[PDB]
Nucleic acid binder design. Structure first.
Lengths: 292, 255
RNA sequence: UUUAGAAGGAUUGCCGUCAGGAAAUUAGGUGCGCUUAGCAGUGUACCGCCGGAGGCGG
Protein backbone atom coordinates (compact mmCIF):
# COMPACT_ATOMS: atom_id res chain seq x y z
CA UNK A 1 0.00 0.00 0.00
CA UNK A 2 2.99 2.31 -0.41
CA UNK A 3 2.69 5.05 -2.97
CA UNK A 4 5.69 7.29 -2.36
CA UNK A 5 8.59 8.23 -0.15
CA UNK A 6 7.78 10.34 2.94
CA UNK A 7 8.08 14.12 3.20
CA UNK A 8 11.06 13.80 5.57
CA UNK A 9 13.55 10.92 5.43
CA UNK A 10 17.18 11.18 6.49
CA UNK A 11 19.99 8.90 7.62
CA UNK A 12 23.27 9.41 9.46
CA UNK A 13 26.70 8.09 8.68
CA UNK A 14 27.74 4.77 10.05
CA UNK A 15 31.43 5.43 9.32
CA UNK A 16 32.68 8.50 11.22
CA UNK A 17 36.18 9.73 10.44
CA UNK A 18 38.28 12.15 12.46
CA UNK A 19 40.55 14.81 11.02
CA UNK A 20 44.19 14.01 10.35
CA UNK A 21 47.18 15.68 11.99
CA UNK A 22 50.62 15.70 10.36
CA UNK A 23 53.84 14.79 12.19
CA UNK A 24 57.46 14.37 11.10
CA UNK A 25 59.97 11.76 12.19
CA UNK A 26 63.02 9.79 11.09
CA UNK A 27 62.67 6.25 9.86
CA UNK A 28 65.02 4.04 11.78
CA UNK A 29 63.85 5.73 15.00
CA UNK A 30 60.17 6.10 14.15
CA UNK A 31 58.96 4.22 17.21
CA UNK A 32 60.67 6.60 19.65
CA UNK A 33 60.50 10.09 18.22
CA UNK A 34 58.04 12.71 16.91
CA UNK A 35 58.18 16.41 16.01
CA UNK A 36 55.66 19.08 14.97
CA UNK A 37 55.20 19.89 11.28
CA UNK A 38 54.05 23.45 10.62
CA UNK A 39 53.06 25.80 7.81
CA UNK A 40 55.67 28.25 6.49
CA UNK A 41 54.25 31.59 5.38
CA UNK A 42 50.83 32.13 -0.70
CA UNK A 43 51.47 29.52 2.00
CA UNK A 44 53.53 26.39 1.78
CA UNK A 45 54.63 23.36 3.71
CA UNK A 46 57.93 21.45 3.55
CA UNK A 47 59.85 19.02 5.76
CA UNK A 48 62.95 19.94 7.77
CA UNK A 49 66.57 19.06 6.93
CA UNK A 50 66.88 16.23 9.49
CA UNK A 51 63.67 14.21 8.98
CA UNK A 52 62.52 11.99 6.12
CA UNK A 53 59.08 10.69 7.14
CA UNK A 54 55.54 12.08 7.33
CA UNK A 55 53.25 10.48 9.93
CA UNK A 56 49.51 10.83 9.40
CA UNK A 57 47.15 9.82 12.23
CA UNK A 58 43.35 9.50 12.17
CA UNK A 59 40.62 7.32 13.63
CA UNK A 60 37.30 5.77 12.60
CA UNK A 61 34.10 5.00 14.56
CA UNK A 62 31.72 2.36 13.17
CA UNK A 63 27.99 2.37 14.03
CA UNK A 64 25.07 0.00 13.30
CA UNK A 65 22.90 0.66 10.26
CA UNK A 66 19.42 -0.25 11.55
CA UNK A 67 19.63 2.28 14.40
CA UNK A 68 20.75 5.06 12.08
CA UNK A 69 17.51 6.56 10.76
CA UNK A 70 17.06 10.14 11.92
CA UNK A 71 13.59 10.96 10.56
CA UNK A 72 10.73 9.03 8.96
CA UNK A 73 7.25 10.56 8.77
CA UNK A 74 5.53 7.24 7.87
CA UNK A 75 5.80 4.15 10.10
CA UNK A 76 4.98 1.74 7.25
CA UNK A 77 8.03 2.75 5.21
CA UNK A 78 10.18 2.31 8.34
CA UNK A 79 8.80 -1.21 8.72
CA UNK A 80 9.66 -1.87 5.07
CA UNK A 81 13.27 -0.61 5.44
CA UNK A 82 13.86 -2.62 8.63
CA UNK A 83 12.61 -5.83 6.99
CA UNK A 84 14.78 -5.30 3.87
CA UNK A 85 17.95 -4.69 5.92
CA UNK A 86 17.12 -7.83 7.93
CA UNK A 87 16.88 -9.73 4.61
CA UNK A 88 20.40 -8.60 3.63
CA UNK A 89 21.76 -9.48 7.06
CA UNK A 90 20.43 -12.98 6.35
CA UNK A 91 22.28 -13.40 3.00
CA UNK A 92 25.56 -11.48 3.40
CA UNK A 93 26.74 -10.30 6.78
CA UNK A 94 27.85 -6.91 5.31
CA UNK A 95 31.20 -8.64 4.55
CA UNK A 96 31.72 -7.58 0.92
CA UNK A 97 31.36 -3.83 1.51
CA UNK A 98 33.45 -3.92 4.72
CA UNK A 99 36.15 -5.98 2.98
CA UNK A 100 36.24 -3.28 0.30
CA UNK A 101 36.52 -0.52 2.96
CA UNK A 102 39.44 -2.23 4.76
CA UNK A 103 41.01 -2.75 1.33
CA UNK A 104 40.77 1.00 0.66
CA UNK A 105 42.47 1.54 4.03
CA UNK A 106 45.24 -0.91 3.11
CA UNK A 107 45.92 0.48 -0.40
CA UNK A 108 46.58 3.87 1.32
CA UNK A 109 44.32 5.88 -0.99
CA UNK A 110 43.94 8.41 1.90
CA UNK A 111 47.34 9.90 1.00
CA UNK A 112 46.23 11.59 -2.16
CA UNK A 113 49.10 13.21 -4.06
CA UNK A 114 51.20 12.50 -1.05
CA UNK A 115 51.74 9.01 -2.45
CA UNK A 116 53.60 9.56 -5.74
CA UNK A 117 57.35 9.21 -5.35
CA UNK A 118 57.33 7.57 -1.93
CA UNK A 119 59.88 4.84 -1.30
CA UNK A 120 58.46 2.82 1.63
CA UNK A 121 54.93 3.21 3.02
CA UNK A 122 53.66 1.23 6.01
CA UNK A 123 50.26 1.37 7.73
CA UNK A 124 49.39 -0.09 11.14
CA UNK A 125 45.78 -0.56 12.25
CA UNK A 126 44.93 -0.83 15.94
CA UNK A 127 41.57 -1.93 17.38
CA UNK A 128 41.23 -1.90 21.21
CA UNK A 129 44.58 -2.75 22.86
CA UNK A 130 45.97 -5.04 20.16
CA UNK A 131 48.11 -3.92 17.20
CA UNK A 132 47.65 -5.60 13.87
CA UNK A 133 50.49 -6.71 11.51
CA UNK A 134 51.50 -3.86 9.20
CA UNK A 135 50.83 -3.37 5.49
CA UNK A 136 53.36 -2.89 2.69
CA UNK A 137 50.97 -0.47 0.90
CA UNK A 138 52.84 -0.68 -2.43
CA UNK A 139 52.10 -4.38 -2.94
CA UNK A 140 48.49 -3.32 -3.53
CA UNK A 141 46.89 -1.66 -6.54
CA UNK A 142 44.04 0.85 -6.91
CA UNK A 143 42.13 -1.28 -9.41
CA UNK A 144 41.81 -4.68 -7.73
CA UNK A 145 40.33 -5.69 -4.36
CA UNK A 146 42.23 -8.46 -2.56
CA UNK A 147 40.02 -10.97 -0.73
CA UNK A 148 42.50 -13.56 0.61
CA UNK A 149 44.60 -11.63 3.12
CA UNK A 150 44.36 -12.70 6.76
CA UNK A 151 44.33 -9.40 8.67
CA UNK A 152 41.92 -7.74 6.20
CA UNK A 153 39.41 -10.57 6.80
CA UNK A 154 39.99 -10.42 10.56
CA UNK A 155 39.23 -6.67 10.69
CA UNK A 156 36.33 -6.84 8.21
CA UNK A 157 34.58 -9.47 10.34
CA UNK A 158 34.53 -7.06 13.31
CA UNK A 159 33.36 -4.14 11.15
CA UNK A 160 30.70 -6.38 9.67
CA UNK A 161 29.14 -7.66 12.78
CA UNK A 162 28.81 -4.10 13.97
CA UNK A 163 27.19 -2.85 10.88
CA UNK A 164 24.67 -5.63 11.57
CA UNK A 165 23.82 -5.59 15.24
CA UNK A 166 26.07 -7.84 17.30
CA UNK A 167 28.22 -5.06 18.73
CA UNK A 168 27.26 -1.49 19.38
CA UNK A 169 30.37 0.42 18.38
CA UNK A 170 33.88 -0.07 17.06
CA UNK A 171 36.79 2.38 17.43
CA UNK A 172 39.61 1.91 14.89
CA UNK A 173 42.85 3.91 14.93
CA UNK A 174 45.26 4.04 11.98
CA UNK A 175 48.87 5.34 11.68
CA UNK A 176 50.94 5.80 8.48
CA UNK A 177 54.66 6.26 7.62
CA UNK A 178 55.53 7.84 4.24
CA UNK A 179 59.24 8.22 3.28
CA UNK A 180 59.38 11.00 0.72
CA UNK A 181 62.81 12.27 1.79
CA UNK A 182 64.44 15.31 3.39
CA UNK A 183 63.46 18.84 2.25
CA UNK A 184 60.48 17.75 0.15
CA UNK A 185 57.01 19.31 0.06
CA UNK A 186 54.12 17.92 2.08
CA UNK A 187 50.83 18.85 0.26
CA UNK A 188 48.24 19.25 3.07
CA UNK A 189 44.65 20.32 2.39
CA UNK A 190 43.40 23.75 1.40
CA UNK A 191 40.86 26.19 2.69
CA UNK A 192 38.25 28.10 0.92
CA UNK A 193 39.13 31.29 2.63
CA UNK A 194 36.95 32.69 -0.14
CA UNK A 195 43.93 35.63 -2.39
CA UNK A 196 46.47 32.81 -2.18
CA UNK A 197 46.65 29.10 -1.36
CA UNK A 198 45.60 29.18 2.29
CA UNK A 199 46.51 25.80 3.78
CA UNK A 200 44.59 24.02 6.54
CA UNK A 201 45.91 24.06 10.11
CA UNK A 202 44.72 21.66 12.82
CA UNK A 203 45.94 22.36 16.39
CA UNK A 204 48.91 24.31 15.05
CA UNK A 205 50.16 21.50 12.81
CA UNK A 206 48.86 20.55 9.35
CA UNK A 207 46.38 17.97 8.22
CA UNK A 208 43.62 16.83 5.90
CA UNK A 209 39.91 17.48 6.29
CA UNK A 210 37.98 14.39 7.34
CA UNK A 211 35.76 14.59 4.24
CA UNK A 212 38.73 13.86 1.93
CA UNK A 213 39.76 10.85 4.01
CA UNK A 214 36.13 9.67 3.90
CA UNK A 215 35.85 10.15 0.12
CA UNK A 216 38.91 8.02 -0.30
CA UNK A 217 37.44 5.13 1.55
CA UNK A 218 34.07 5.11 -0.23
CA UNK A 219 35.53 4.47 -3.73
CA UNK A 220 34.30 0.88 -3.75
CA UNK A 221 31.72 1.03 -6.54
CA UNK A 222 32.59 -1.41 -9.33
CA UNK A 223 28.97 -2.22 -10.13
CA UNK A 224 27.94 0.52 -12.57
CA UNK A 225 26.49 0.12 -16.16
CA UNK A 226 29.51 1.08 -18.30
CA UNK A 227 32.29 -0.62 -16.34
CA UNK A 228 33.73 -2.76 -19.16
CA UNK A 229 34.59 0.33 -21.22
CA UNK A 230 35.99 2.43 -18.37
CA UNK A 231 37.50 0.00 -15.84
CA UNK A 232 38.17 2.02 -12.68
CA UNK A 233 36.48 2.30 -9.25
CA UNK A 234 34.30 5.35 -8.63
CA UNK A 235 33.12 6.98 -5.38
CA UNK A 236 29.75 5.85 -4.03
CA UNK A 237 27.55 8.82 -4.93
CA UNK A 238 23.85 9.11 -5.74
CA UNK A 239 23.66 10.25 -9.38
CA UNK A 240 27.20 8.86 -9.79
CA UNK A 241 29.36 11.84 -10.57
CA UNK A 242 33.12 11.27 -10.35
CA UNK A 243 34.47 14.78 -10.76
CA UNK A 244 37.71 13.92 -12.61
CA UNK A 245 35.98 12.48 -15.66
CA UNK A 246 33.27 15.14 -15.86
CA UNK A 247 30.41 12.94 -17.06
CA UNK A 248 27.59 11.40 -14.92
CA UNK A 249 28.29 7.62 -14.76
CA UNK A 250 24.76 6.72 -13.59
CA UNK A 251 22.18 9.33 -14.82
CA UNK A 252 19.33 6.93 -15.37
CA UNK A 253 17.48 3.71 -14.31
CA UNK A 254 20.32 2.43 -12.09
CA UNK A 255 20.27 5.60 -9.94
CA UNK A 256 19.70 5.24 -6.19
CA UNK A 257 16.35 7.10 -6.27
CA UNK A 258 14.82 4.82 -8.91
CA UNK A 259 16.44 1.69 -7.49
CA UNK A 260 15.06 2.26 -3.98
CA UNK A 261 11.66 3.19 -5.44
CA UNK A 262 11.76 -0.21 -7.21
CA UNK A 263 12.52 -2.07 -3.97
CA UNK A 264 10.20 -0.59 -1.30
CA UNK A 265 7.30 1.03 -3.15
CA UNK A 266 6.78 -2.09 -5.32
CA UNK A 267 8.39 -5.37 -4.18
CA UNK A 268 10.86 -6.59 -6.81
CA UNK A 269 14.01 -8.63 -6.18
CA UNK A 270 17.00 -6.62 -7.37
CA UNK A 271 20.27 -8.40 -8.25
CA UNK A 272 22.88 -8.65 -5.50
CA UNK A 273 24.98 -5.84 -7.07
CA UNK A 274 22.11 -3.36 -6.76
CA UNK A 275 21.55 -4.33 -3.11
CA UNK A 276 25.30 -3.90 -2.55
CA UNK A 277 24.97 -0.33 -3.88
CA UNK A 278 21.85 0.62 -1.96
CA UNK A 279 22.98 -0.68 1.38
CA UNK A 280 26.10 1.45 0.78
CA UNK A 281 24.35 4.66 -0.04
CA UNK A 282 22.57 4.04 3.29
CA UNK A 283 25.94 3.63 5.08
CA UNK A 284 26.92 7.04 3.74
CA UNK A 285 23.83 9.12 4.55
CA UNK A 286 21.79 11.98 3.21
CA UNK A 287 18.45 13.72 2.88
CA UNK A 288 16.74 11.02 0.81
CA UNK A 289 13.33 12.70 0.79
CA UNK A 290 10.64 13.96 -1.60
CA UNK A 291 8.61 17.01 -2.54
CA UNK A 292 5.14 15.56 -2.03
CA UNK B 1 0.87 31.37 -47.53
CA UNK B 2 -2.66 32.56 -47.36
CA UNK B 3 -3.79 33.50 -43.88
CA UNK B 4 -1.51 35.10 -41.35
CA UNK B 5 -1.01 37.63 -38.59
CA UNK B 6 1.28 40.69 -38.58
CA UNK B 7 2.07 42.85 -35.54
CA UNK B 8 2.84 46.57 -35.73
CA UNK B 9 4.55 47.04 -32.39
CA UNK B 10 4.65 50.15 -30.13
CA UNK B 11 3.52 52.94 -32.49
CA UNK B 12 3.70 56.52 -31.18
CA UNK B 13 1.02 58.91 -32.47
CA UNK B 14 0.98 62.63 -31.69
CA UNK B 15 -2.09 64.92 -31.97
CA UNK B 16 -4.98 62.60 -32.87
CA UNK B 17 -8.60 63.81 -32.76
CA UNK B 18 -10.49 63.19 -29.58
CA UNK B 19 -13.93 64.74 -30.10
CA UNK B 20 -17.02 62.88 -31.36
CA UNK B 21 -19.81 65.30 -30.28
CA UNK B 22 -20.59 63.57 -26.94
CA UNK B 23 -17.26 61.90 -26.09
CA UNK B 24 -13.77 63.27 -25.37
CA UNK B 25 -11.15 60.55 -25.20
CA UNK B 26 -10.09 57.56 -27.32
CA UNK B 27 -10.63 58.18 -31.07
CA UNK B 28 -13.45 56.43 -32.91
CA UNK B 29 -12.87 52.88 -34.20
CA UNK B 30 -13.57 53.86 -37.84
CA UNK B 31 -10.30 55.81 -37.98
CA UNK B 32 -8.32 52.82 -36.68
CA UNK B 33 -9.78 50.60 -39.40
CA UNK B 34 -9.28 53.42 -41.90
CA UNK B 35 -5.55 53.28 -41.25
CA UNK B 36 -5.61 49.57 -42.16
CA UNK B 37 -7.66 50.09 -45.33
CA UNK B 38 -5.36 52.95 -46.41
CA UNK B 39 -2.36 50.66 -45.85
CA UNK B 40 -4.07 48.03 -48.02
CA UNK B 41 -4.78 50.54 -50.81
CA UNK B 42 -1.21 51.85 -50.88
CA UNK B 43 0.20 48.31 -50.80
CA UNK B 44 -2.02 47.24 -53.73
CA UNK B 45 -0.74 50.04 -55.98
CA UNK B 46 2.86 48.91 -55.43
CA UNK B 47 1.68 45.45 -56.74
CA UNK B 48 1.85 43.56 -53.43
CA UNK B 49 -1.51 41.78 -53.32
CA UNK B 50 -2.88 41.60 -49.77
CA UNK B 51 -6.19 42.03 -47.95
CA UNK B 52 -6.59 43.08 -44.31
CA UNK B 53 -9.85 41.79 -42.79
CA UNK B 54 -9.41 42.45 -39.08
CA UNK B 55 -7.65 44.83 -36.67
CA UNK B 56 -6.80 44.46 -33.00
CA UNK B 57 -6.23 47.51 -30.80
CA UNK B 58 -3.84 47.24 -27.85
CA UNK B 59 -3.16 50.21 -25.57
CA UNK B 60 0.10 50.74 -23.66
CA UNK B 61 0.08 54.44 -22.61
CA UNK B 62 -1.85 57.65 -23.25
CA UNK B 63 -1.85 61.37 -22.53
CA UNK B 64 -4.50 64.03 -23.12
CA UNK B 65 -3.49 67.58 -24.06
CA UNK B 66 -4.37 69.83 -21.16
CA UNK B 67 -4.07 69.62 -17.39
CA UNK B 68 -5.94 68.30 -14.37
CA UNK B 69 -7.36 70.75 -11.84
CA UNK B 70 -7.25 70.48 -8.06
CA UNK B 71 -10.72 69.05 -7.93
CA UNK B 72 -9.64 66.24 -10.21
CA UNK B 73 -11.24 67.28 -13.48
CA UNK B 74 -9.72 67.66 -16.96
CA UNK B 75 -9.36 70.99 -18.77
CA UNK B 76 -8.45 70.66 -22.45
CA UNK B 77 -6.24 72.83 -24.66
CA UNK B 78 -6.28 73.92 -28.30
CA UNK B 79 -3.80 75.47 -30.73
CA UNK B 80 -4.17 79.11 -31.71
CA UNK B 81 -6.40 79.43 -34.81
CA UNK B 82 -4.79 80.79 -37.93
CA UNK B 83 -6.56 81.73 -41.15
CA UNK B 84 -9.81 79.95 -42.02
CA UNK B 85 -11.47 80.36 -45.45
CA UNK B 86 -14.70 82.30 -45.54
CA UNK B 87 -15.87 85.88 -45.18
CA UNK B 88 -13.66 87.00 -42.27
CA UNK B 89 -10.46 85.61 -43.76
CA UNK B 90 -8.31 88.77 -44.08
CA UNK B 91 -8.62 89.42 -40.33
CA UNK B 92 -5.80 88.81 -37.87
CA UNK B 93 -7.77 86.98 -35.16
CA UNK B 94 -9.91 83.96 -36.05
CA UNK B 95 -12.55 82.02 -34.20
CA UNK B 96 -12.35 79.16 -31.74
CA UNK B 97 -14.42 76.03 -32.38
CA UNK B 98 -14.77 72.78 -30.39
CA UNK B 99 -11.77 70.44 -30.44
CA UNK B 100 -9.69 68.00 -28.37
CA UNK B 101 -6.40 66.15 -28.95
CA UNK B 102 -4.75 63.04 -27.47
CA UNK B 103 -1.37 61.24 -27.62
CA UNK B 104 -1.20 57.43 -27.72
CA UNK B 105 1.20 54.48 -27.77
CA UNK B 106 -0.47 51.45 -29.33
CA UNK B 107 0.17 48.13 -31.04
CA UNK B 108 -1.90 46.82 -33.95
CA UNK B 109 -2.71 43.21 -34.86
CA UNK B 110 -3.60 42.67 -38.52
CA UNK B 111 -5.11 39.56 -40.11
CA UNK B 112 -3.78 39.41 -43.67
CA UNK B 113 -4.73 36.92 -46.39
CA UNK B 114 -2.88 36.99 -49.69
CA UNK B 115 -0.90 34.92 -52.17
CA UNK B 116 2.31 35.25 -50.08
CA UNK B 117 2.69 36.31 -46.44
CA UNK B 118 6.42 36.52 -45.69
CA UNK B 119 8.95 38.98 -44.22
CA UNK B 120 9.17 40.78 -47.58
CA UNK B 121 5.56 41.78 -46.93
CA UNK B 122 6.72 43.17 -43.56
CA UNK B 123 9.40 45.22 -45.33
CA UNK B 124 6.76 46.50 -47.78
CA UNK B 125 4.58 47.53 -44.81
CA UNK B 126 7.64 49.20 -43.22
CA UNK B 127 8.23 51.31 -46.35
CA UNK B 128 4.56 52.40 -46.41
CA UNK B 129 3.89 53.19 -42.72
CA UNK B 130 6.00 56.35 -42.94
CA UNK B 131 3.66 58.22 -45.32
CA UNK B 132 0.32 57.53 -43.59
CA UNK B 133 -1.29 59.02 -40.49
CA UNK B 134 -3.44 57.58 -37.70
CA UNK B 135 -6.61 59.57 -36.82
CA UNK B 136 -5.21 62.85 -38.10
CA UNK B 137 -1.97 62.42 -36.19
CA UNK B 138 1.63 61.94 -37.24
CA UNK B 139 3.65 58.79 -36.53
CA UNK B 140 6.92 59.52 -34.75
CA UNK B 141 8.53 56.07 -34.35
CA UNK B 142 7.87 52.33 -34.21
CA UNK B 143 9.80 49.37 -32.80
CA UNK B 144 9.36 46.42 -35.17
CA UNK B 145 7.04 44.89 -37.75
CA UNK B 146 6.93 41.13 -37.26
CA UNK B 147 4.85 38.00 -37.85
CA UNK B 148 3.20 36.22 -34.94
CA UNK B 149 1.94 32.64 -34.70
CA UNK B 150 0.34 32.18 -31.26
CA UNK B 151 -0.92 34.20 -28.28
CA UNK B 152 2.46 34.10 -26.52
CA UNK B 153 4.40 36.43 -28.84
CA UNK B 154 2.00 39.37 -28.34
CA UNK B 155 3.52 41.93 -25.93
CA UNK B 156 1.99 43.02 -22.65
CA UNK B 157 -0.89 45.45 -22.87
CA UNK B 158 -4.62 45.90 -22.75
CA UNK B 159 -6.99 45.31 -25.62
CA UNK B 160 -10.32 46.97 -26.34
CA UNK B 161 -13.38 44.75 -26.84
CA UNK B 162 -17.08 45.31 -27.46
CA UNK B 163 -19.54 44.88 -24.57
CA UNK B 164 -23.03 45.39 -25.99
CA UNK B 165 -24.70 42.88 -23.65
CA UNK B 166 -24.01 45.10 -20.61
CA UNK B 167 -25.96 47.90 -22.36
CA UNK B 168 -28.94 46.05 -23.77
CA UNK B 169 -29.37 44.38 -20.44
CA UNK B 170 -29.66 47.17 -17.94
CA UNK B 171 -32.44 49.16 -16.34
CA UNK B 172 -34.02 52.16 -17.95
CA UNK B 173 -36.69 53.58 -20.18
CA UNK B 174 -34.39 54.84 -22.91
CA UNK B 175 -30.86 53.96 -24.10
CA UNK B 176 -29.12 56.97 -22.55
CA UNK B 177 -30.47 56.00 -19.12
CA UNK B 178 -29.26 52.46 -19.87
CA UNK B 179 -25.76 53.80 -20.61
CA UNK B 180 -25.62 55.98 -17.47
CA UNK B 181 -26.81 53.16 -15.19
CA UNK B 182 -24.48 50.61 -16.84
CA UNK B 183 -21.58 53.01 -16.25
CA UNK B 184 -22.58 53.49 -12.60
CA UNK B 185 -22.65 49.73 -11.97
CA UNK B 186 -19.35 48.73 -13.62
CA UNK B 187 -16.54 51.30 -13.38
CA UNK B 188 -14.12 49.71 -15.87
CA UNK B 189 -16.25 50.37 -18.98
CA UNK B 190 -15.89 53.30 -21.40
CA UNK B 191 -18.30 54.72 -24.01
CA UNK B 192 -17.05 54.43 -27.60
CA UNK B 193 -18.22 55.38 -31.10
CA UNK B 194 -18.80 52.44 -33.43
CA UNK B 195 -19.95 53.80 -36.79
CA UNK B 196 -22.71 55.71 -38.53
CA UNK B 197 -26.46 55.55 -39.23
CA UNK B 198 -28.44 57.07 -42.10
CA UNK B 199 -30.58 60.22 -42.15
CA UNK B 200 -31.30 60.47 -45.90
CA UNK B 201 -31.38 58.38 -49.08
CA UNK B 202 -28.57 57.47 -51.46
CA UNK B 203 -28.14 59.94 -54.31
CA UNK B 204 -26.04 62.68 -55.85
CA UNK B 205 -25.82 66.12 -54.29
CA UNK B 206 -23.77 69.20 -55.20
CA UNK B 207 -20.47 69.88 -53.47
CA UNK B 208 -18.92 66.46 -52.93
CA UNK B 209 -15.33 65.42 -52.29
CA UNK B 210 -15.49 62.92 -55.17
CA UNK B 211 -18.31 63.77 -57.62
CA UNK B 212 -18.64 60.27 -59.14
CA UNK B 213 -19.67 58.21 -56.09
CA UNK B 214 -22.79 57.64 -53.98
CA UNK B 215 -23.67 59.85 -51.06
CA UNK B 216 -25.64 59.60 -47.87
CA UNK B 217 -25.97 62.04 -44.97
CA UNK B 218 -25.08 60.32 -41.70
CA UNK B 219 -25.07 60.54 -37.89
CA UNK B 220 -22.63 58.79 -35.53
CA UNK B 221 -23.74 55.94 -33.25
CA UNK B 222 -22.26 55.06 -29.85
CA UNK B 223 -21.82 51.97 -27.67
CA UNK B 224 -19.91 50.52 -24.70
CA UNK B 225 -16.54 48.83 -24.38
CA UNK B 226 -13.98 47.63 -21.89
CA UNK B 227 -10.40 46.49 -21.46
CA UNK B 228 -8.89 43.03 -21.09
CA UNK B 229 -5.24 42.09 -20.64
CA UNK B 230 -3.23 40.00 -23.10
CA UNK B 231 -2.58 37.13 -20.67
CA UNK B 232 -6.29 36.60 -19.83
CA UNK B 233 -7.43 36.51 -23.45
CA UNK B 234 -8.87 33.27 -24.77
CA UNK B 235 -8.64 33.40 -28.56
CA UNK B 236 -7.07 35.68 -31.16
CA UNK B 237 -10.46 36.18 -32.85
CA UNK B 238 -12.20 37.71 -29.81
CA UNK B 239 -10.16 40.91 -30.20
CA UNK B 240 -10.46 41.62 -33.96
CA UNK B 241 -12.68 44.37 -35.33
CA UNK B 242 -14.42 44.06 -38.69
CA UNK B 243 -16.57 46.01 -41.13
CA UNK B 244 -20.27 45.16 -41.43
CA UNK B 245 -22.83 46.92 -43.62
CA UNK B 246 -26.59 46.53 -43.42
CA UNK B 247 -29.10 48.77 -45.23
CA UNK B 248 -28.90 52.19 -43.58
CA UNK B 249 -26.25 51.13 -41.05
CA UNK B 250 -22.44 51.34 -41.20
CA UNK B 251 -20.87 49.46 -38.35
CA UNK B 252 -17.76 48.13 -36.69
CA UNK B 253 -18.24 45.01 -34.56
CA UNK B 254 -16.28 42.21 -32.97
CA UNK B 255 -18.15 39.14 -34.02
C1' U C 1 -8.56 56.31 -48.81
C1' U C 2 -9.26 57.77 -41.12
C1' U C 3 -15.63 63.96 -37.58
C1' A C 4 -10.54 64.35 -44.10
C1' G C 5 -7.44 68.84 -45.01
C1' A C 6 -5.08 74.30 -41.52
C1' A C 7 -3.04 76.91 -36.82
C1' G C 8 2.85 81.45 -32.31
C1' G C 9 -1.17 82.47 -26.29
C1' A C 10 1.87 86.59 -24.50
C1' U C 11 4.18 90.71 -21.80
C1' U C 12 4.63 92.57 -15.78
C1' G C 13 4.64 91.57 -10.38
C1' C C 14 7.07 92.37 -2.18
C1' C C 15 1.94 87.52 1.29
C1' G C 16 2.85 89.33 5.93
C1' U C 17 2.83 90.61 11.65
C1' C C 18 1.79 87.40 16.84
C1' A C 19 1.54 82.85 19.76
C1' G C 20 2.53 77.36 26.50
C1' G C 21 -0.08 70.87 23.96
C1' A C 22 -0.90 68.72 28.67
C1' A C 23 -2.01 65.61 32.80
C1' A C 24 -2.34 59.48 33.99
C1' U C 25 -0.79 54.27 33.05
C1' U C 26 1.56 46.10 34.70
C1' A C 27 2.53 43.20 27.46
C1' G C 28 2.30 38.60 29.29
C1' G C 29 2.33 33.08 30.01
C1' U C 30 4.44 28.04 26.15
C1' G C 31 8.15 25.82 22.87
C1' C C 32 13.80 19.87 19.70
C1' G C 33 16.42 23.29 13.71
C1' C C 34 18.47 19.25 11.41
C1' U C 35 20.34 14.59 7.61
C1' U C 36 24.79 15.12 4.14
C1' A C 37 29.75 16.94 1.80
C1' G C 38 37.13 16.07 -1.15
C1' C C 39 39.09 23.93 -3.51
C1' A C 40 42.80 25.60 -7.29
C1' G C 41 43.61 25.53 -15.28
C1' U C 42 49.80 22.35 -13.68
C1' G C 43 50.67 27.51 -9.00
C1' U C 44 53.41 29.81 -11.95
C1' A C 45 55.72 32.09 -16.23
C1' C C 46 63.32 31.30 -14.93
C1' C C 47 68.52 32.45 -16.99
C1' G C 48 70.67 33.84 -21.90
C1' C C 49 71.08 34.46 -27.38
C1' C C 50 70.42 36.81 -32.27
C1' G C 51 69.51 41.40 -33.71
C1' G C 52 67.24 46.60 -36.23
C1' A C 53 59.95 44.94 -34.56
C1' G C 54 59.90 39.88 -35.55
C1' G C 55 62.83 35.17 -33.57
C1' C C 56 65.14 31.06 -31.31
C1' G C 57 68.36 27.46 -27.43
C1' G C 58 68.09 25.16 -21.90
Amino acid sequence: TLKSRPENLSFARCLNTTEAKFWQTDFLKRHTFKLPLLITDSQSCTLSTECDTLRIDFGIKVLPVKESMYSCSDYNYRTAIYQKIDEYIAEDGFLTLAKRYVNNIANARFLWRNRKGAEIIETIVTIEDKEYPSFNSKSFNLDTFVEDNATINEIAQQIADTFAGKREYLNIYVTCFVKIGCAMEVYPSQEMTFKGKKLFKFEGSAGMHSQKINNALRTIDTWYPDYTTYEFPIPVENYGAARSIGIPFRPDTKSFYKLIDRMILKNEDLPIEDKHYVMAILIRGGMFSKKQ
Amino acid sequence: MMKGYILLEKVNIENANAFNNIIVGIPAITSFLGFARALERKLNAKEIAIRINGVGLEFHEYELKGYKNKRGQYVTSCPLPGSIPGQNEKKLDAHIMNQAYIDLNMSFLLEVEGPHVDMSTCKSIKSTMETLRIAGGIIRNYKKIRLIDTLADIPYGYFLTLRQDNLNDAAGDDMLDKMIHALQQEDTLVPIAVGFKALSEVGHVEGQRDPEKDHCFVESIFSLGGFECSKILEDINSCLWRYKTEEGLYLCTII
